[PDB]
Amino acid sequence: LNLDSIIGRLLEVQGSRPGKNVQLTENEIRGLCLKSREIFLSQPILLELEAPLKICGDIHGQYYDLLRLFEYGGFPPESNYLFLGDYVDRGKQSLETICLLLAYKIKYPENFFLLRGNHECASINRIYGFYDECKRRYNIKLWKTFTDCFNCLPIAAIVDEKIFCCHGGLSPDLQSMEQIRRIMRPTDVPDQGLLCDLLWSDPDKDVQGWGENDRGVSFTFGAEVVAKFLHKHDLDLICRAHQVVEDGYEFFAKRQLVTLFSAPNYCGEFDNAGAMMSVDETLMCSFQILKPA
Amino acid sequence: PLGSRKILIRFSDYVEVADAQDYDRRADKPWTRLTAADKAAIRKELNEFKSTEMEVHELSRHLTR
Ligand SMILES: [Cl-]
Ligand SMILES: [Mn+2]
Ligand SMILES: [Mn+2]
């Protein structure tokens, strides 16, 4: 795998006017999928990470915004990164986005990590853009190759035994972390149950306990569910993504949960900032914002 | 190990703010061109795809209610 060449071509478009494509060969992309999949399967499904670390939320194929976030935080290996999922769909350049993220996972496998979002599953990204982008620029078989790779992404991470990270949220069925660790990969994301909830659930300030979810999938959870979960597992913070928030980050339940969304001006339809959370080695957490002007 | 029962996290009073690039992020919305018959076909395509070629461990859901 000519990995350095691939990263060079992906980064070559930094000085370009947004929208310039990077058309790697199909075989290079398959190589990124195959080698990253092997690494995902060799590492835990519940990651145990240590700070310093940069944590990013949704990207949704906004590749030129991803390039600016790395400029902001330092390109690997200058900084360590945990991404909370939703690399593809909705944006103009999902293929460049996932290829750069997969290439950096292969290049720096102990310092660069990707979680699974709800858009990293066949049923969702068949519809919301990634399949169409694969088919237009390559072929359907390549989308199936990505699906196999996505089916092996890890599901959650714990930073410094204190920050629980996943894409969506909590689950009424999540009593022990061991329940996450026993999940075998590759796996699809079912339309209900523990793995679905980790990728799909939402906090809600108006709900007591567990409520129905307006997406028609999973649940909402209230502030006391978060507090009880943090206390039982000796955790300090839940870090999740999954929802567009005006400032790029948004606290819930007296800063016991934070939502991160890293795609500014999302889809060209929202006026939102994108944010990353930087965790230094003393567990001081700070927010870096990319705001529309 | 780094765990403990004491609260260790802190949040900084400073927030770093920088400007996003000014570009057109509007993208094509192919799913808006799908009819009902289109969606029905795709559901069957996905069904066949998962039933016959997507490798997994036949994972699925638990329930008790
Ligand atoms: Cl596994
Ligand atoms: Mn989402
Ligand atoms: Mn969304």
Author numbering:
A (entry chain A): 7 to 57, 60, 60A, 60B, 61 to 299
B (entry chain C): 512 to 576
Article, verbatim:
The three Protein Phosphatase 1 (PP1) isoforms regulate diverse cellular processes, acting in partnership with over 200 different PP1-interacting proteins (PIPs). The four Phosphatase and actin regulator (Phactr) proteins are novel PIPs that are implicated in cytoskeletal regulation in animal models and cell culture settings. Here, we show that Phactr1 confers sequence-specificity on the Phactr1/PP1 holoenzyme. We show that efficient catalysis requires interactions between conserved hydrophobic residues in the substrate and a novel Phactr1-PP1 composite surface, which comprises a hydrophobic pocket and associated amphipathic cavity with a surrounding basic rim.
We determined the structures of purified Phactr1(507-580)/PP1α(7-300) (1.9 Å) and Phactr1(516-580)/PP1α(7-300) (1.94 Å), which crystallised at pH 8.5 and pH 5.25, respectively, and exhibit differing conformations of Phactr1 residues C-terminal to residue 567. In both structures, the PP1 catalytic site contains two presumed manganese ions and a phosphate anion, as previously reported, and its conformation is virtually identical to that seen in other PP1 complexes, such as spinophilin/PP1 (RMSD 0.23 Å over 255 Cα atoms). In contrast, at pH 5.25 Phactr1 C-terminal sequences adopted a distinct and poorly resolved conformation, perhaps induced by protonation of the three C-terminal histidines.
